[PDB]
């Protein structure tokens, strides 16, 4: 709407902004993240990991 500056999701987090100069609406996607798992044969066999 003409007066809305940003938007939110169902969990009250920010997901969009209004550019202060161009008034373009921009979605905010979080930067990629995730867990890291290390797969190892065990240090008593080999030191190669994935």
């Amino acid at each position: 709407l003409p007066f809305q500056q940003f938007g939110r999701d169902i969990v009250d987090t920010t997901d969009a902004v209004r550019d202060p100069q161009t008034l373009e609406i921009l979605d905010i996607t979080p930067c990629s993240f995730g867990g890291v798992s290390v797969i190892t044969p065990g240090t008593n066999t080999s030191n190669q990991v994935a």
């Binding site: 999701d9 969990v11 987090t13 997901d15 979080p30 990629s32 993240f33 995730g34």
Partner: protein, 36 residues
């Protein structure tokens, strides 16, 4: 004749139960905030 080779009943069971996470479709909000 159907992909996944599930029975008509299994197909119905998957069609009745749906996932509705507060996120968006991802191929692998989408990852919430530190929650995977």
């Amino acid at each position: 004749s159907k992909p996944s080779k599930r029975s008509p009943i299994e197909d119905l069971l998957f069609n009745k139960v749906t996932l509705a996470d507060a996120g968006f479709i991802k191929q692998y909000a989408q990852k919430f905030n530190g929650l995977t």
